[PDB]
Structures are given as structure tokens and as C-alpha cells.
Design an enzyme around this catalytic site. Structure first.
Site, PDB file in Angstrom:
ATOM      1  N   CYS A  73       7.864   5.268  -3.547  1.00  0.00           N
ATOM      2  CA  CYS A  73       6.551   5.019  -2.952  1.00  0.00           C
ATOM      3  C   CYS A  73       5.507   6.041  -3.369  1.00  0.00           C
ATOM      4  O   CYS A  73       5.638   7.240  -3.224  1.00  0.00           O
ATOM      5  CB  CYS A  73       6.690   5.096  -1.424  1.00  0.00           C
ATOM      6  N   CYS A  98       4.193   8.213  -0.420  1.00  0.00           N
ATOM      7  CA  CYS A  98       5.111   9.066   0.317  1.00  0.00           C
ATOM      8  C   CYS A  98       4.906  10.561   0.025  1.00  0.00           C
ATOM      9  O   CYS A  98       4.516  10.988  -1.101  1.00  0.00           O
ATOM     10  CB  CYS A  98       6.567   8.599   0.085  1.00  0.00           C
ATOM     11  N   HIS A 115       7.026   6.339   6.207  1.00  0.00           N
ATOM     12  CA  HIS A 115       6.878   5.160   5.381  1.00  0.00           C
ATOM     13  C   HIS A 115       7.058   3.860   6.146  1.00  0.00           C
ATOM     14  O   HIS A 115       6.557   2.814   5.767  1.00  0.00           O
ATOM     15  CB  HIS A 115       7.924   5.273   4.239  1.00  0.00           C
ATOM     16  N   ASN A 128      -6.028  -2.842   5.405  1.00  0.00           N
ATOM     17  CA  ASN A 128      -5.559  -4.149   5.003  1.00  0.00           C
ATOM     18  C   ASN A 128      -4.095  -3.975   5.221  1.00  0.00           C
ATOM     19  O   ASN A 128      -3.446  -3.107   4.655  1.00  0.00           O
ATOM     20  CB  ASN A 128      -5.601  -4.397   3.544  1.00  0.00           C
ATOM     21  N   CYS A 138      -0.821  -6.937   0.409  1.00  0.00           N
ATOM     22  CA  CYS A 138      -0.258  -5.582   0.414  1.00  0.00           C
ATOM     23  C   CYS A 138       1.203  -5.502  -0.021  1.00  0.00           C
ATOM     24  O   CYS A 138       2.120  -5.964   0.679  1.00  0.00           O
ATOM     25  CB  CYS A 138      -0.354  -4.860   1.779  1.00  0.00           C
ATOM     26  N   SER A 139       1.403  -4.889  -1.184  1.00  0.00           N
ATOM     27  CA  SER A 139       2.746  -4.731  -1.746  1.00  0.00           C
ATOM     28  C   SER A 139       3.487  -3.530  -1.141  1.00  0.00           C
ATOM     29  O   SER A 139       4.696  -3.516  -0.945  1.00  0.00           O
ATOM     30  CB  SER A 139       2.690  -4.562  -3.281  1.00  0.00           C
ATOM     31  N   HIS A 167       3.721   1.091   3.034  1.00  0.00           N
ATOM     32  CA  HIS A 167       3.525   2.440   3.562  1.00  0.00           C
ATOM     33  C   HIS A 167       2.192   2.319   4.302  1.00  0.00           C
ATOM     34  O   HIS A 167       1.164   1.955   3.770  1.00  0.00           O
ATOM     35  CB  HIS A 167       3.338   3.529   2.499  1.00  0.00           C
ATOM     36  N   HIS A 187      -1.292   2.709   5.580  1.00  0.00           N
ATOM     37  CA  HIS A 187      -2.444   3.441   5.151  1.00  0.00           C
ATOM     38  C   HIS A 187      -3.659   2.582   5.228  1.00  0.00           C
ATOM     39  O   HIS A 187      -3.642   1.369   5.384  1.00  0.00           O
ATOM     40  CB  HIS A 187      -2.208   3.811   3.692  1.00  0.00           C
ATOM     41  N   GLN A 212      -8.103   2.733   3.949  1.00  0.00           N
ATOM     42  CA  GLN A 212      -8.939   3.228   2.860  1.00  0.00           C
ATOM     43  C   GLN A 212     -10.300   3.550   3.395  1.00  0.00           C
ATOM     44  O   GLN A 212     -10.647   3.085   4.482  1.00  0.00           O
ATOM     45  CB  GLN A 212      -9.238   2.130   1.844  1.00  0.00           C
ATOM     46  N   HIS A 252     -17.652  -0.484  11.906  1.00  0.00           N
ATOM     47  CA  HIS A 252     -19.046  -0.653  11.537  1.00  0.00           C
ATOM     48  C   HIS A 252     -19.793   0.253  12.519  1.00  0.00           C
ATOM     49  O   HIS A 252     -19.718   0.060  13.751  1.00  0.00           O
ATOM     50  CB  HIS A 252     -19.625  -2.043  11.742  1.00  0.00           C
ATOM     51  N   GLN A 286     -14.396 -23.230  10.754  1.00  0.00           N
ATOM     52  CA  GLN A 286     -13.935 -24.162  11.793  1.00  0.00           C
ATOM     53  C   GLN A 286     -12.655 -23.591  12.439  1.00  0.00           C
ATOM     54  O   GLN A 286     -11.790 -22.973  11.799  1.00  0.00           O
ATOM     55  CB  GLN A 286     -13.737 -25.522  11.121  1.00  0.00           C
TER      56      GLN A 286
HETATM   57  O1  LIG Z   1      -1.035   6.528  -8.064  1.00  0.00           O
HETATM   58  C1  LIG Z   1      -1.599   5.786  -7.280  1.00  0.00           C
HETATM   59  C2  LIG Z   1      -1.020   4.632  -6.687  1.00  0.00           C
HETATM   60  C3  LIG Z   1      -1.702   3.887  -5.850  1.00  0.00           C
HETATM   61  N1  LIG Z   1      -3.011   4.170  -5.500  1.00  0.00           N
HETATM   62  C4  LIG Z   1      -3.798   3.351  -4.558  1.00  0.00           C
HETATM   63  O2  LIG Z   1      -3.107   3.426  -3.332  1.00  0.00           O
HETATM   64  C5  LIG Z   1      -2.985   2.116  -2.730  1.00  0.00           C
HETATM   65  C6  LIG Z   1      -1.623   1.436  -2.789  1.00  0.00           C
HETATM   66  O3  LIG Z   1      -0.879   1.389  -4.025  1.00  0.00           O
HETATM   67  P1  LIG Z   1       0.625   0.833  -4.130  1.00  0.00           P
HETATM   68  O4  LIG Z   1       1.123   0.514  -5.494  1.00  0.00           O
HETATM   69  O5  LIG Z   1       1.538   1.689  -3.343  1.00  0.00           O
HETATM   70  O6  LIG Z   1       0.342  -0.611  -3.377  1.00  0.00           O
HETATM   71  P2  LIG Z   1      -0.748  -1.665  -3.720  1.00  0.00           P
HETATM   72  O7  LIG Z   1      -2.057  -1.000  -3.949  1.00  0.00           O
HETATM   73  O8  LIG Z   1      -0.353  -2.192  -5.059  1.00  0.00           O
HETATM   74  O9  LIG Z   1      -0.422  -2.745  -2.579  1.00  0.00           O
HETATM   75  C7  LIG Z   1      -4.123   1.371  -3.385  1.00  0.00           C
HETATM   76  O10 LIG Z   1      -5.328   1.693  -2.715  1.00  0.00           O
HETATM   77  C8  LIG Z   1      -4.123   1.905  -4.819  1.00  0.00           C
HETATM   78  O11 LIG Z   1      -5.404   1.691  -5.463  1.00  0.00           O
HETATM   79  C9  LIG Z   1      -3.658   5.260  -6.024  1.00  0.00           C
HETATM   80  O12 LIG Z   1      -4.808   5.455  -5.674  1.00  0.00           O
HETATM   81  N2  LIG Z   1      -2.920   6.024  -6.896  1.00  0.00           N
HETATM   82 FE   LIG Z   2     -19.625  -5.482  12.547  1.00  0.00          FE
HETATM   83 ZN   LIG Z   3       5.830   5.598   1.450  1.00  0.00          ZN
END
Ligand SMILES: O=c1ccn([C@@H]2O[C@H](COP(=O)(O)OP(=O)(O)O)[C@@H](O)[C@H]2O)c(=O)[nH]1
Ligand SMILES: [Fe+3]
Ligand SMILES: [Zn+2]
Ligand SMILES: O=c1ccn([C@@H]2O[C@H](COP(=O)(O)O)[C@@H](O)[C@H]2O)c(=O)[nH]1
Ligand SMILES: [Fe+3]
Ligand SMILES: [Zn+2]
Lengths: 340, 329
Positions: B35, B38, B98, B136, B143-144, B147, B149, B151, B264, B306
Site C-alpha cells: 500500500c 501505509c 490500513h 471518496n 477507489c482501488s 486505505h 484517506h 484529499q 463547503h 429523479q
Molecule cells: O505514489 C503515490 C501513489 C498514490 N498517490 C495518490 O494517492 C491516492 C491513492 O492511490 P492508490 O494507488 O493507493 O489508489 P487509487 O488512487 O488508485 O485508488 C490518489 O490520490 C493518488 O493520486 C500519490 O499521490 N502517490
Molecule cells: Fe454545499
Molecule cells: Zn495502507
């Protein structure tokens, strides 16, 4: 140094919605990770001769078939919601109806795989339904939601037509913006736009004698397209027979380029926007259709319009220009019809 | 045959966006060796994460905005016009765990997340007028990496949603002499029909004009302009309200509930922003089950949103479950 939209992030304006789209052209790139249906389905509720979940049987139709949605979200006799000026919690009435349009009896043939004659019949049916509903409702919305990526478990090719007693959000906004433009410029916004695109060509995807399909300058979805007639046309019902038969050709070419992009049935949501039946002078309108596809990188990699996009504004990585170039690079003859 | 909002379709207005919504009521380890988020792991870029404790914030390696992009040429063309765009993006790791999502963290850990949101907002707001903190969550949102988090993006301009909310709130304040969402919070508090979470200083409701099935709006009871203005009491109570709201969402179908959320607040544009009211929106896609989701396509992309379940039914359904996460029970 010097601004170059091919390299620098920027925002592009959408004159039809009044919103901006954030384009980020040279985003840092992630490390390279590496590289049939039956014509008739016995259980399909849309197939000819079959029984719908409701018990009503579909006729043994041979072309298009239109029926009222068994689960219509709107009804024609709904009572009116009370009049309120409440700045915070207010409602308005809603009346309408919804119909499903089977494009053909062939359960496995999508739009780009249908013949021009079959596509012309579909356009004929869109016109007939729009003329009929427009007599009672000011807004008629013809659309199509295709593919599982769009939530369709039943692949029977079909579209829908909703009629509204009010102008939904997109319609009222497009109507207002188009009116303003027309009042100041004295020419319809989209007609002037078609002229500019025909002189440019960088965003052009399909060009026929009476139709033009481009990835609009303000495109939000990766391969989104905007299909417009070259002459000033207010509604689908106003197309001449020649424009109609030609529309069938443009549709076939456009949908075939989409399926050839990733060599798969390309999902999307598409719909027609034309002048409303509100009794007003609608010279400011220009009939057009939008195609909004979710796919971005592969037959399986799609764009998810979330997070920042839902809380702030749409953001895209591939430019409209790059998207058009990719759509022009493939063939306009569907893979299944070409022997390739 | 009297109009009955419980049976009859109708449209409801969203005062924050000026749009109508159509309603038809008849219708995993703690540490992962690979990860990138991590603690102590290396990122794509080869950069190495420190053995952080609590939150960890870093500049996004694939940021879509940069702070020095040249300006774009001024243009008033009514058809094809562009504008400049500068900013930055950072990733905020919620905790080193994680596998622990928001509802599963302690109120103390969530309070650290709030403090980080405040620190990051204050910092970025010195340079940028708009700061967007968001999250998200889930595969359904694309989201793959599970972990946990969020933004934080900063923009040199006010994005579409911010511009519209700022203008509509400003108009309402001019006419009513009171902030739109402060009034709304007082009315919902007195009603209860759409309330889902109520704490000392916060209220979470399924807004009257909700578009997504179980969408919620989290607001402070008192007038607060930005997240950075919360008192320590408000901040600690925010952590508890977030734990309760998110716990209710996960208990609905007993699974990690996906959503996209964001705050917001007033922009840092130097104006009088008393018209603003800090708020967070939660936009979850699930509708009937842990697998059956809402698709905002077709009619909705071409005309208007709707919905089948009313805001009152969705709130009643969220109120019916426990607010203690099913794994903490
Ligand atoms: O070396 C890295 C790896 C990931 N990310 C960012 O961290 C988040 C998650 O990346 P990861 O591959 O773990 O999951 P994904 O973004 O593909 O769901 C996203 O905002 C990426 O743009 C980053 O900034 N640097
Ligand atoms: Fe709003
Ligand atoms: Zn992790
Ligand atoms: O017996 C049926 C089955 C489906 N539909 C309608 O046709 C569309 C089919 O798409 P879907 O719900 O299968 O995804 C829907 O709007 C649905 O209400 C009917 O009207 N009758
Ligand atoms: Fe349109
Ligand atoms: Zn079928």
C-alpha cells in the site's frame, strides 16, 4: 512561460449550461502497469411476442414498438402541489408520462449494427412520439441508456421517451442561455458554433451532408459528443425527409466509431434537446443530441464523476481535441459488419 | 383527490443550487506491505512514507493543478473561451490503520482528522480562495485502495458549485437578513422528520431537496463560516457526530457504505461572507442493498435528477438503525 492549452491546465466554458470545465492536459502519468447474443430471448420482456412482467403481451412487431412504461414515474392526472413562496422548503406539481421504444425485434442488434432503413424508422418513430406528446406536454425527452455500466441488465436495444408538464432543469437552463445569446447576437448559438467547428475541424468526429458530430469544446465526459444538424432546425419533427435519412447515416457512423474505439459495445446515455412546445417564439433553439459515455481508458476502465467533481466542478485529463483524434482514428463501419 | 406529497410526484427546490428535484413517491490488515499510503512504505515516486502516527498529509504525486501555471489570455468570446487555473492537491491519510474507516476510529482519532482539516484549510487559504476537503470512499466511487484517506484541493478560482452556493446564499441573506443554512438548521431542528443525527453542536439531516437516496447534509447549529472557526467544543463534537452518521450508514446494509463527501465553507476571497454557513454533503450511491445502486443517468443527465424514496423515508430508515458500528457492538 507562454500559455499553451495543450500543456497547461485551464477551465473551458460551456455556453449551454453556464458552467466551466476544468481541463488538466499534461497530468503526471502513473507507471505503466502493463497491457454473442440470440436474436430472440424467451425471457426478454422487450422481445416480440413475449409477456411483460405485468402480464401484457408484446405484439409480434417487426420494426419499432412503443408502449407506456409499466412503471411510469409520472402520470397525467396528478393533483397539483400547493402554491408556496417558502424560500427554503418548496415544491411544485409534476405531470407527464413515459414510454419505452423497442428499436427492433432483434434482441442482439444495437444502433450501429442496424441498417440505415431500420435507423430511419427509429427516427420516424421519435418524430411521431414527439409530435403526439408535444400536443399536451411542453417538454418531450427522447433518450437512450445503454449498457451495464449505465445500469442496464437487459441488453434488448431500446430507448425511452418522457413527457413533462414542466421544463426540467437542463431544458430551462439551455432555453434561457440560448435566448440570451440570440437576443444579443441575432443568430442561434449552436448554428454559429456549427460554423466555427466546420472551419476548424480539430474536434470533428463525423460529418455528413446535413449532420455534424463533434467532441464539443466544453466536453465534460471523455468521449462525449454533440450531434447537430448543419441547418437551423428547432425540433426533431421539423426535419425534412433528406435530413432524416441522413441522420440515420450519421447515427450509424457515430455509434460505429464509438464501438470500434475499444472493440466492444460502448455504453452511454444519449438524448435529444429541441425547442419546447410552449407556444413561444423559439427561434433561438437549435435541435441537438448529447452523447455521454463513461468509458475512458479501456473497455473496462471508466471515468467516475465523483469527489471533487460532485463537490466542485468536472475535471478531465484527456482534452476534447485528443478525444476527437482518437475517435477519428478508428473505422466508421462497425466491427461486426466489417470483415476485420 | 387532494395533492398528497406522500403519494403524488412533485418537484422540490434546492435553495443551494437553484435546481428542482423530481420525486415520484409511488414508484484486511492494519498494515499492507504494498500500500502506497501505509506508514513506512514507499510511493510510486520512490518517496518513502514516514512511520507516521495519526494523520499524514503529502502533496499528490499526480496533481491536476500546479501553483505556477501561466495565465490564459483574457477573452470574452461567447462560444469558445478558457480561463486560467492554478492550485494544488494533497492526500490526507486518516490514520496508519490500513483497515479502519471513519466509523471505526475513536473519537480521539477523528478529532485529529478534524484538526488536520483545519490546519490544511488555514494554510492553503492564505494563497487560494477555494479549499476543497473531500473523501471518496469505496469501489463504487472508483477507489482501488481501501486505505482510509481523503484529499484536499486548493483552487485559484471558485469552482462551479462554490460559485453558485456563494451567490444563492448571498442573495438569501440580503433579503432575509439571516444565513440560509442557519435558518434551515433551526427549522429542521424543530421538525424532526428528516433528522438523522443530532449532537450538542451538530445536526445531520437528509435535506428536504436531497438528490441521492440516502444523501445527508451535516451542519453546525451555530453560525460558523469555515472549519477553521470551530471552537474546540464544536470540533470535538464534530468528531462524535461524524462517528455516529457514518456508523448509521454502515449499519443500513451492514457493509462499508460508499460515498463521496466534502466540506463547503466561506471562500478566502477577502469579502464579507457572513452569508455563509459551513456544511458538509454526503452523496452515497447505494439504494436498495449493498449491491443495488442508484445510477444518475439518462433522464437525469438530460433533464433533471429523479428519486423514488422520499427524503422523509430515507431519514426514517437511517434513524431506525443503531448509531454504534456493527463491529463495535
Ligand atoms: O505514489 C503515490 C501513489 C498514490 N498517490 C495518490 O494517492 C491516492 C491513492 O492511490 P492508490 O494507488 O493507493 O489508489 P487509487 O488512487 O488508485 O485508488 C490518489 O490520490 C493518488 O493520486 C500519490 O499521490 N502517490
Ligand atoms: Fe454545499
Ligand atoms: Zn495502507
Ligand atoms: O415489464 C416491463 C419491464 C420493464 N419496463 C420498463 O422498461 C425499462 C427497462 O429497463 P430496466 O428497468 O430493465 O433496467 C424501465 O424503465 C422499466 O420500467 C416495463 O415498462 N415493463
Ligand atoms: Fe442540450
Ligand atoms: Zn429482447
Amino acid at each position: 512561460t507562454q500559455f499553451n492549452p495543450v500543456d497547461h491546465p485551464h477551465r473551458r466554458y460551456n455556453p449551454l449550461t453556464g458552467q466551466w470545465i476544468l481541463v488538466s492536459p499534461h497530468r503526471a502519468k502513473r507507471p505503466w502497469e502493463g497491457a454473442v447474443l440470440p436474436a430472440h430471448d424467451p425471457d426478454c420482456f422487450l422481445c416480440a411476442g413475449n409477456v411483460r412482467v405485468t402480464g401484457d403481451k408484446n405484439p409480434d412487431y417487426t420494426g419499432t414498438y412503443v408502449f407506456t412504461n409499466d412503471f411510469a414515474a409520472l402520470m397525467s392526472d396528478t393533483p397539483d402541489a400547493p402554491e408556496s413562496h417558502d424560500p427554503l422548503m418548496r415544491c411544485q406539481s409534476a405531470r407527464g408520462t413515459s414510454r419505452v421504444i423497442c428499436f427492433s425485434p432483434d434482441h442482439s442488434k444495437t444502433l450501429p449494427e442496424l441498417s440505415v432503413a431500420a435507423l430511419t424508422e427509429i427516427v420516424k418513430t421519435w418524430q411521431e412520439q414527439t409530435a403526439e406528446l408535444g400536443k399536451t406536454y411542453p417538454w418531450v425527452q427522447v433518450f437512450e441508456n445503454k449498457g451495464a455500466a449505465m445500469g442496464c441488465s437487459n441488453p434488448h436495444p431500446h430507448g425511452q421517451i418522457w413527457a413533462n408538464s414542466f421544463l426540467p432543469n437542463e431544458a430551462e437552463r439551455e432555453d434561457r442561455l440560448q435566448k440570451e445569446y440570440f437576443a444579443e447576437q441575432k443568430s442561434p448559438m449552436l448554428v454559429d458554433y456549427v460554423q466555427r467547428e466546420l472551419a476548424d475541424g480539430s474536434r470533428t468526429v463525423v460529418e455528413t451532408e446535413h449532420w455534424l458530430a463533434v467532441v464539443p469544446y466544453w466536453a465534460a465526459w471523455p468521449f462525449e459528443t454533440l450531434l447537430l444538424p448543419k441547418a437551423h432546425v428547432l425540433r426533431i419533427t421539423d426535419l425534412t425527409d433528406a435530413q432524416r435519412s441522413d441522420l440515420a447515416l450519421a447515427l450509424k457512423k457515430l455509434t460505429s466509431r464509438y464501438d470500434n474505439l475499444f472493440q466492444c459495445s460502448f455504453p452511454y446515455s444519449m438524448g435529444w434537446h429541441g425547442a419546447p412546445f410552449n407556444g413561444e417564439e423559439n427561434q433561438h433553439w437549435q435541435l441537438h443530441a448529447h452523447f455521454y459515455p463513461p468509458l475512458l481508458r479501456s473497455a473496462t476502465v471508466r471515468k467516475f464523476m465523483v469527489g471533487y467533481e460532485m463537490l466542485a466542478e468536472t475535471q478531465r485529463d484527456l482534452t476534447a481535441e485528443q478525444a476527437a483524434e482518437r475517435l477519428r482514428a478508428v473505422s466508421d463501419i462497425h466491427f461486426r459488419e466489417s470483415g476485420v
